C-alpha cells in the first residue's frame, strides 16, 4: 500500500531534518558531517537528533544502537538496513 | 521473560533466552504468555488497597440503595378480574377472594 522507501529518499529526509535543526549550519552540513568532531554538538544534542529521526520515520532506534550514529550517512545506513532497503 | 531486555539479540527471541544459560526452575510459569512480575507505576499494596476499597464501597452502597429504594408517588397497578386471577393460572373450580377497584 504505502510506497517503498529508497536510499535517496531516506538521505533527503534525514538531511531535511538536520537542516531544520537550528544548531546546525545548513551550508556546512553534509552526509559525512560528524555531529561532534566537525559540527560541534554534544551528547544531549545527538540524543535529540536521534529522537527527531525516530519521530520522522515512525519507528524507535534502541539506545544501544542510537549512541553510535554520529553521521547522517550512518543514520541513513541504519534506517535502510532496518527497513530492508537495498536501492 | 517480560522483565528481560527486549532489545537484546536473544537466541530465542520469543522466549527471550540464550543457548546454554541456566534456566529458571519456574520458566514454565514465567513465560510471556503467563505470570508477569514486571514493575508497575503504582505499588502493589496501593493498587490492592484502591481496588478493594472501590469494590467494598460499591457493594456497601448497593446494599444501602437496596434498603433505601427509589420509586414514584403512585399506588399499586390495578388489574381487572381479581387481578387477572384466571389469566395467571388460577384454578377455575375454586372461587378467588374478590378484588374490587374503585374510581378516584
Amino acid at each position: 500500500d504505502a510506497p517503498p522507501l529508497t536510499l535517496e529518499a531516506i538521505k533527503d529526509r534525514v538531511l531535511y531534518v538536520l537542516k531544520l535543526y537550528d544548531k546546525i549550519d545548513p551550508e556546512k552540513l553534509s552526509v559525512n558531517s560528524h555531529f561532534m568532531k566537525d559540527l560541534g554538538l554534544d551528547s544531549l544534542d545527538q540524543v535529540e537528533i536521534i529522537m527527531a529521526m525516530e519521530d520522522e520515520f515512525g519507528f524507535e532506534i534502541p539506545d544501544i544502537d542510537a549512541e553510535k550514529l554520529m553521521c547522517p550517512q550512518e543514520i541513513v545506513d541504519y534506517i535502510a538496513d532496518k527497513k530492508d532497503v537495498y536501492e | 521473560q517480560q522483565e528481560r531486555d527486549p532489545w537484546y539479540d536473544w537466541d530465542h527471541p520469543d522466549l527471550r533466552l540464550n543457548w546454554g544459560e541456566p534456566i529458571h526452575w519456574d520458566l514454565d510459569m514465567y513465560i510471556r504468555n503467563r505470570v508477569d512480575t514486571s514493575p508497575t507505576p503504582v505499588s502493589w499494596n496501593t493498587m490492592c488497597k484502591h481496588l478493594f476499597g472501590f469494590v467494598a464501597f460499591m457493594l456497601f452502597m448497593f446494599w444501602v440503595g437496596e434498603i433505601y429504594p427509589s420509586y414514584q408517588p403512585v399506588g399499586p397497578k390495578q388489574y381487572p378480574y381479581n387481578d387477572l386471577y384466571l389469566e395467571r393460572g388460577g384454578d377455575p373450580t375454586k372461587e378467588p377472594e374478590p378484588v374490587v377497584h374503585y374510581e378516584i
Partner: protein, 55 residues
C-alpha cells in the same frame, strides 16, 4: 450536555502551558481500576505455583 461541557472544558485545559503530575483518581481510571494487574497476576501465580509445588 453536562458531560459534553465538562469533557470539552477539561480537553481545552490541555492547551495551557501548565504541567502537573497525575492524581490518584487518574491513575486508578487509566490503569483500568487495577483489576487486570491484581486479578491477572495473583490468582494465576498461585494456581500455577500450587500446580507444581503441591500436585
Amino acid at each position: 450536555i453536562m458531560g459534553f461541557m465538562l469533557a470539552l472544558e477539561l480537553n481545552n485545559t490541555t492547551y495551557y502551558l501548565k504541567f502537573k503530575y497525575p492524581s490518584q483518581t487518574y491513575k486508578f481510571s487509566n490503569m483500568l481500576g487495577y483489576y487486570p494487574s491484581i486479578m491477572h497476576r495473583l490468582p494465576t501465580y498461585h494456581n500455577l505455583s500450587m500446580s507444581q509445588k503441591s500436585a
